[PDB]
Amino acid sequence: FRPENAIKRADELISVGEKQAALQSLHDFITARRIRWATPSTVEPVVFKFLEIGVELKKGKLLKDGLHQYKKLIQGSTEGLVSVGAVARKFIDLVESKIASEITSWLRFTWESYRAVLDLLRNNALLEITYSGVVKKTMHFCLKYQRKNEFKRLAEMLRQHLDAANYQQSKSGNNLVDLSDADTLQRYLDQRFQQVDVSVKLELWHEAYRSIEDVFHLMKISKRAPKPSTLANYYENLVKVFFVSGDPLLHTTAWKKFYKLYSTNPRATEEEFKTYSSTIFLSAISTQLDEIPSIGYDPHLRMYRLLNLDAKPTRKEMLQSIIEDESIYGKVDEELKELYDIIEVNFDVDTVKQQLENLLVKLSSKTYFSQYIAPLRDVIMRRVFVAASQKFTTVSQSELYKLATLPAPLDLSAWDIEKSLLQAAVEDYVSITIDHESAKVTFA
């Protein structure tokens, strides 16, 4: 019949308190078999009314069924797909106004709404823009309401979506997503870039880590480069991830990738180049000694390829690739260069406590130095134990342990020191026999 008549009958049915009968009346109209031929433009207002009522009554299933059934009828024309996307947007704007007005079941309703719209707009060339919009809105929603569980499921949904796109690539059907086109990719990559950001901000490190692989695969296929802003943010997220992760070589790498990209910004102060360069160098000195093959087991081995590295580097290699690169080594604080001399170049155990004692007063004031104190200490002490292994045959525990006591803030209690000595022995940086009877240590 007529849309005006439909709206009227709805408005009348709400006055009698038959709200559900009104929603159900509109559903019938817009999912009617005659809608396939109707002008999308002139039925869309009824779909809008259907959405208005459906949101108030929180009838999520009927809304979903309404949209899907309507789209199947209408998606034949270009104007049809346009109406679909427009009705998707209307739905989202309606529920998004309800969160503004409002509540637990309202958040879940909102999630289910975002989810439904995304699953409705999935893998359609004409709806790529609206979908990419809803993805961004959905990720902003999860971060804004710390909905970590739903976020994890969202991420999985986006993965399944892309898997279907890839399967459909070799099908040449109309209105199918073309993963060959850079604009399509620019959006998909932007979504995955944002997926990583929210992951990091919600401290879901396992999910952050999975999304790095998601992003990488899109960067591979992508011909067109991303915005240097959004890419710089990405690398800045990787520095966070790999620090939490305990992969220090990857951490330095993410920093270098970020430094190399930030040195091409017009608004980049010299004070920043000072502190960033310093951070990068310290984190490379602060890296665990790989001067001996690992125990060894490493579940993060695949990640080197994900950071575009052909293979796992050494700390010596990384540290040299930092010293040689003048763009970085140039703006590095002097204290760190001296440190590098003291620990890596000319290491003398008989003088290291002193060198460090004179250098740490200046180093402690540095902002970045605070967060690398532990691993650095570990490195220095490892070196001290190795060199001590070279210096003694049977040394008193008193002598050895005090000789391995760095100055603050690298200081350690005597028992934590023996603890380090044994760890070095387990990793075979030294073989020892400790006689607790005599309070002596023998390197045999």
Numbering used by the authors: 6 to 107, 151 to 492
Quoted from the paper:
Eukaryotic translation initiation requires the recruitment of the large, multiprotein eIF3 complex to the 40S ribosomal subunit. EIF3 is a large and structurally complex molecular assembly that, in the majority of eukaryotes, consists of 11–13 subunits (eIF3a-eIF3m) with a molecular weight of 600–800 kDa. We present X-ray structures of all major components of the minimal, six-subunit Saccharomyces cerevisiae eIF3 core. Yeast eIF3 engages 40S in a clamp-like manner, fully encircling 40S to position key initiation factors on opposite ends of the mRNA channel, providing a platform for the recruitment, assembly, and regulation of the translation initiation machinery.
The structure of the full-length PCI domain of eIF3a (S. cer. residues 1–496) was solved by single-wavelength anomalous dispersion (SAD) with selenomethionine (Se-Met)-labeled protein to a resolution of 3.3 Å. As observed in a truncated structure of eIF3a and in previously characterized PCI modules (Ellisdon and Stewart, 2012; Khoshnevis et al., 2014), the WHD is structurally similar to other PCI proteins, whereas the N-terminal domain has a series of distinct, flatly arranged helical repeats. The positioning of these helices is reminiscent of the concertina-like arrangement of tetratricopeptide repeats (TPR), although, as in other PCI proteins, TPR-like sequence elements are not detectable. Unlike other PCI HDs, which typically have a significant right-handed superhelical twist, eIF3a has two distinct segments to its repeat. Whereas helices 10–14 have a right-handed pitch, helices 1–9 are arranged along a flat plane that is distinct from other PCI proteins with extended helical repeats. PCI modules are characterized by an N-terminal helical domain (HD) and a C-terminal winged helix domain (WHD), which mediates PCI dimerization (Ellisdon et al., 2012).
